[PDB]
Predict the structure.
Amino acid sequence: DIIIATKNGKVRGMQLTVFGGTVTAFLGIPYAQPPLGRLRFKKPQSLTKWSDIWNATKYANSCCQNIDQSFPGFHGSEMWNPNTDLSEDCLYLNVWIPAPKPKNATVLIWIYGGGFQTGTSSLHVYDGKFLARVERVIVVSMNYRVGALGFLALPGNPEAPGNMGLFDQQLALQWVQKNIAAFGGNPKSVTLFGESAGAASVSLHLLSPGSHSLFTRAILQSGSFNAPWAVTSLYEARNRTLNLAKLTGCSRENETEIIKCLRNKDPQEILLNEAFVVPYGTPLSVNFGPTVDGDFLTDMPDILLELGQFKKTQILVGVNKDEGTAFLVYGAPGFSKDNNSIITRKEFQEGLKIFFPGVSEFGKESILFHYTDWVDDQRPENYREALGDVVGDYNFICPALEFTKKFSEWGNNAFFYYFEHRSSKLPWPEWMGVMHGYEIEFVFGLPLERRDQYTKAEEILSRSIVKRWANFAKYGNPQETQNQSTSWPVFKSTEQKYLTLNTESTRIMTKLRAQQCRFWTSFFPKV
Ligand SMILES: *[C@@H]1O[C@H](CO[C@@H]2O[C@@H](C)[C@@H](O)[C@@H](O)[C@@H]2O)[C@@H](O[C@@H]2O[C@H](CO)[C@@H](O)[C@H](O)[C@H]2NC(C)=O)[C@H](O)[C@H]1NC(C)=O
Ligand SMILES: *[C@@H]1O[C@H](CO[C@@H]2O[C@@H](C)[C@@H](O)[C@@H](O)[C@@H]2O)[C@@H](O[C@@H]2O[C@H](CO)[C@@H](O)[C@H](O)[C@H]2NC(C)=O)[C@H](O)[C@H]1NC(C)=O
Ligand SMILES: *[C@@H]1O[C@H](CO[C@@H]2O[C@@H](C)[C@@H](O)[C@@H](O)[C@@H]2O)[C@@H](O[C@@H]2O[C@H](CO)[C@@H](O)[C@H](O)[C@H]2NC(C)=O)[C@H](O)[C@H]1NC(C)=O
Ligand SMILES: O=C(NC[C@H](O)CNCC1CCCCC1)C(c1ccccc1)c1ccccc1
Ligand SMILES: *[C@@H]1O[C@H](CO[C@@H]2O[C@@H](C)[C@@H](O)[C@@H](O)[C@@H]2O)[C@@H](O)[C@H](O)[C@H]1NC(C)=O
Ligand SMILES: *[C@@H]1O[C@H](CO)[C@@H](O)[C@H](O)[C@H]1NC(C)=O
Ligand SMILES: *[C@@H]1O[C@H](CO)[C@@H](O)[C@H](O)[C@H]1NC(C)=O
Ligand SMILES: [Cl-]
Ligand SMILES: [Cl-]
Ligand SMILES: [Cl-]
Ligand SMILES: [Cl-]
Ligand SMILES: [Cl-]
Ligand SMILES: [Cl-]
Ligand SMILES: [Cl-]
Ligand SMILES: [Cl-]
Ligand SMILES: [Cl-]
Ligand SMILES: [Cl-]
Ligand SMILES: [Cl-]
Ligand SMILES: [Cl-]
Ligand SMILES: [Cl-]
Ligand code: NA
Ligand code: NA
């Protein structure tokens, strides 16, 4: 029996057998008053002390969210849907500590993605027990509010100030500072890592002054705040808030009377209405996301990045080879996970209208012009691969690259990776390649489980990635120093070296997607 005295009370964990060893898991520790009733849409409130032994032996409720129902019964989509009950009462976190108890272990804090509308820390691919067992770090992950319940914005109004889900994250980082030493953890050695909207979240903690003292280093997988989907403007946010008010019958004149009316609405009413607050949205539609609230985020983050206004520390940043492919089968005409998705020039043009709905004809033409000059015009995959590249370069790869160049220009070490391995267990079709989100299982060491039917070469690749991530968190330097590994050079703004992650030869390359990213980063924002 394993009871720890946290600052708010005693929690009891459970014992886990992992690779002939043991991990102690604390699942579902609460870190805030449940944001219910009059607390819905507010910032999270501190938790009152309990005098019993809290039983932290099962994953807690997931936060209210809409489910991906586009492919019922398909593991490729459903692996991402919540695996606990949905509830507003969802502000809980998990802790995996090595056995026996460490003395001063580095802590890894995971922040999941999901487009800021979905996600949960209880997902199988976020199980931190392998990192605890293998690298003797402490893995922490938290649930945070998402969708309108987490990011509805009436800027300046504390009844719904925006960025509540980011403050949920922040309060959990504070829990680790106040409590993790009781678990064997070193609160002075905390590395945030996250993927997609989780990665964008991590980058925003690098800008928020309130999070500066709550972590040491940061890892950003397939995401950063300067990606076009990551920050809702004050314009759209209030137009989206106001729409939601109309759809729910809550249009009032006193701006607080609106919030009051959305608080007697059942969570389902709010959820089913989030889809329509945007007139013509995209598959990547972040209906309710981070805004410039003037509390968590003091200015527009592009300006903060550009003028060096962020925590000075090391970062590890990276992207996958085919970020853009997953989105094509959520709306692009002619695409389907159940065929090879050979699309015509006309279908490609229609696809740009889907992903760039309010962009001018000239802007859409300029995308076509940059991506439709190929070596071979007979190649029938040409338009199919071009549209995936368009979506991935615009939405993920070029913003991550630009974040890395700009962040490192202020003098910190940065490490950039290009993940190009397609999991042998990937349930999506082959033409979709190295998809968005399918490095995560390698980062968490799932292929280290010999029973799970990954190949040997994947166990090795995961084993090395896990080492490099752990060395990064522990030492600010993501090297594998023992097994004659390729040395990972720092990403400098001149040479822009990066490391490729794959099962064969890990190489050092320069200036990833240079041509494509000059278009997206220099020319396209003019249109
Ligand atoms: C746990 O270790 C810390 C030292 O942390 C080091 O620095 C961090 C930035 C991180 O990178 C870790 O890997 C390092 O191990 C100890 O902190 C010291 O505390 C004493 C007070 O007793 C203080 O005088 C020292 O200045 C601190 N050292 C540093 C480097 O800041 C802490 O005591 C250790 N905890 C336990 C329980 O042993
Ligand atoms: C700001 O919001 C308006 C209002 O959104 C419309 O009504 C909501 C209830 C929701 O159902 C949305 O999908 C609706 O679009 C939007 O502009 C509207 O555009 C549509 C047609 O595209 C049409 O209803 C009206 O022309 C507009 N509604 C008005 C004027 O009330 C759009 O999101 C934003 N419009 C502007 C001008 O900023
Ligand atoms: C690939 O499939 C898409 C999607 O069509 C559906 O899925 C298929 C697997 C099959 O079950 C079809 O019967 C389904 O309709 C095809 O796109 C459709 O194309 C037809 C005619 O070209 C058109 O009428 C539909 O509107 C299209 N639907 C969508 C969602 O785009 C596409 O033609 C298939 N491509 C190849 C190369 O086989
Ligand atoms: O992740 C989103 N929404 C939550 C959805 O319940 C689940 N996602 C679909 C999965 C399919 C394969 C890998 C990716 C996840 C959304 C998004 C928006 C902005 C940035 C990143 C992601 C999105 C993702 C894929 C396709 C369409 C939309
Ligand atoms: C919390 O859970 C306890 C679980 O029962 C046993 O507790 C320890 C001693 C281990 O042996 C464990 O494996 C067992 O399952 C309950 O005894 C206790 O009443 C519970 N308390 C609350 C408040 O739910
Ligand atoms: C809106 O209602 C709140 C609560 O009663 C009140 O404090 C505020 O002054 C009202 N605003 C206006 C403009 O009347
Ligand atoms: C290095 O190789 C040895 C070979 O036995 C293996 O046990 C070990 O896990 C490897 N280490 C890393 C970090 O890959
Ligand atoms: Cl719960
Ligand atoms: Cl519910
Ligand atoms: Cl599961
Ligand atoms: Cl899986
Ligand atoms: Cl490539
Ligand atoms: Cl052509
Ligand atoms: Cl061009
Ligand atoms: Cl998988
Ligand atoms: Cl093919
Ligand atoms: Cl070299
Ligand atoms: Cl390239
Ligand atoms: Cl250059
Ligand atoms: Cl150009
Ligand atoms: Na390339
Ligand atoms: Na141009």
User: Anything to note?
Assistant: The chain has one domain: 3-327+393-517.
